[PDB]
Amino acid sequence: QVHVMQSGDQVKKPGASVQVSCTTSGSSFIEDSLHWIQQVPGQEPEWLGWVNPRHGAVNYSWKIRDRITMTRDISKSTMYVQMRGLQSDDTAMYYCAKSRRGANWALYWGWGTRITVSS
Amino acid sequence: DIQLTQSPSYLAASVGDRVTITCRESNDLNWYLQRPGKPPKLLISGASKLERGVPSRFRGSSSGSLTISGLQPEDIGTYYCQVFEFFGGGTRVDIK
Ligand SMILES: *[C@@H]1O[C@H](CO)[C@@H](O[C@@H]2O[C@H](CO)[C@@H](O[C@@H]3O[C@H](CO)[C@@H](O)[C@H](O[C@H]4O[C@H](CO)[C@@H](O)[C@H](O)[C@@H]4O[C@H]4O[C@H](CO)[C@@H](O)[C@H](O)[C@@H]4O)[C@@H]3O)[C@H](O)[C@H]2NC(C)=O)[C@H](O)[C@H]1NC(C)=O
Ligand SMILES: *[C@@H]1O[C@H](CO)[C@@H](O)[C@H](O)[C@H]1NC(C)=O
Known part of the structure; x- marks a missing residue:
């Protein structure tokens, strides 16, 4: 029942440093390679x-x-x-994705961090 | 680099009909389900080793393709064929 959690959504002006936090519960943390990925909705995540x-x-x-x-x-x-x-x-x-066995890819996805800027 | 040859991303399957998604390239074949608003859930890792809690119908064609014997409400959504840290093309499904 290992799961991951992350902070909510923040909105701030462009050019400012942003910070986010993630956590994992139910599994060992030392040997598990974490990943951070972003995507434009309805497109291909990078x-x-x-x-x-x-x-x-x-x-x-x-x-x-x-x-x-x-x-x-x-x-x-x-x-x-x-x-x-x-x-x-x-x-x-x-x-904020988490991958088991410290290998490639990822299996557990976060709760959807929404980092947005406005012009 | 490497660009995966993916079939067109549109299907009209509704319930109980074997369809397949083409991701023809090397290797493996990591397939995920993207959820609308909800967090995405991985479908198959390695294209051959199912995990716990996933339906037995989900089958990867080794060094292919997620060949599914039918469509059910719990498997709807975009199917992503990721790779080692590059991605595929994606394929969204819907019920008509
Ligand atoms: C006869 O057999 C029956 C059935 O086989 C026994 O009844 C079962 O007893 C077990 C253990 O008492 C119980 O399993 C627990 O269920 C809890 C509720 O679902 C869970 O919370 C609990 O998990 C915690 O404990 C585990 C260690 O046992 C940890 O590995 C796990 O990570 C959980 O620990 C977290 O939470 C605790 C408390 O919140 C915290 O302190 C920890 O730090 C950690 O954060 C177990 O899974 C079964 O549910 C019982 N089954 C039924 C049907 O009731 C019965 O006990 C046996 N008789 C005798 C005499 O032993
Ligand atoms: C121990 O103290 C150091 C220095 O303050 C700190 O960086 C580290 O996080 C601490 N270790 C623990 C137990 O968290």
Whole structure:
């Protein structure tokens, strides 16, 4: 019955740093690679990054480098995602995905983080 | 890079009719169900090893394709054929 949870939806002006939090309950946290992905609704999700809580090693994507920061706290088994220099064309939806066995892909999806900006 | 050859994303199946979704490329074949508003749920991982709580009708054609023997209300929604961290093309289903 392992599940994941995340914070609600936030609306703020573009150009401001955004921060979100995720947590996982019911499973071991050290050896499970977490993922953070975003999608424009009715389109193809683009993977943003992944983190390995066992040693904190992170990996990002091609269009998100220098604008992403991933932190993990296996102690409280919670993960923080903070993005700086937010642009206009990022009003999309975000999931904090969790993958079993620390392998690729992901199975458990979050509660639908909605990060939006207005012009 | 790699671009998956996907069949057109439109079907008219309603209830109890074997249809398939083409994702012809290498490998595997990770398929997910996208939910409207609700969080998405993965359907099959590895195209051959079903998990717990998923219907036995869901079958992946190895290095293909999610061949489903029929359509039921609990399996409606967009079907995504993801890969190692790239994606597919997607295929949304509906009942007519
Ligand atoms: C004779 O047999 C019957 C049936 O086989 C026995 O009755 C069953 O007893 C078990 C254990 O007492 C019970 O299972 C629990 O059910 C609870 C309610 O569904 C669950 O909450 C509980 O899970 C917690 O405990 C587990 C450890 O046992 C943990 O692994 C699990 O993660 C849960 O722990 C979380 O929650 C607790 C409390 O909230 C917290 O302290 C933890 O830190 C953690 O956060 C068990 O699954 C069955 O439900 C009983 N079955 C029935 C039908 O009642 C009966 O006990 C046997 N007779 C004797 C004498 O033993
Ligand atoms: C222990 O203290 C350090 C330094 O304050 C802190 O970073 C770490 O999270 C703490 N460990 C625990 C048990 O959370």
